[PDB]
């Protein structure tokens, strides 16, 4: 993930000082989609279709 952030245009410094908060942001991003497995997820709708 860190090297990915380096590639996409985020410098080594800010990721080197903000590991945990971006980690928690990644975690809540992954968790929010869990309960969203409904009509709001268009791909879920397309699979049901």
């Amino acid at each position: 993930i860190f090297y990915r952030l380096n590639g996409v245009g985020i410098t080594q410094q800010v990721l080197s000082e903000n590991q945990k908060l971006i980690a928690n942001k990644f975690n809540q991003a992954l968790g929010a989609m869990q309960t969203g497995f409904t009509t709001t997820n268009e791909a879920f709708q397309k699979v049901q279709d």
Partner: protein, 44 residues
Amino acid sequence: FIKTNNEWSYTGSSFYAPEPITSLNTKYVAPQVTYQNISTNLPP
């Protein structure tokens, strides 16, 4: 960077190629705690 037994040494990204370390195969980079450090076998 792969260490042999005949030392850390350069190899290509697609073959097990044993080669020494020069400046013509690497770039510079910022400090980072997440890797290794040497004090006597210094690459040029």
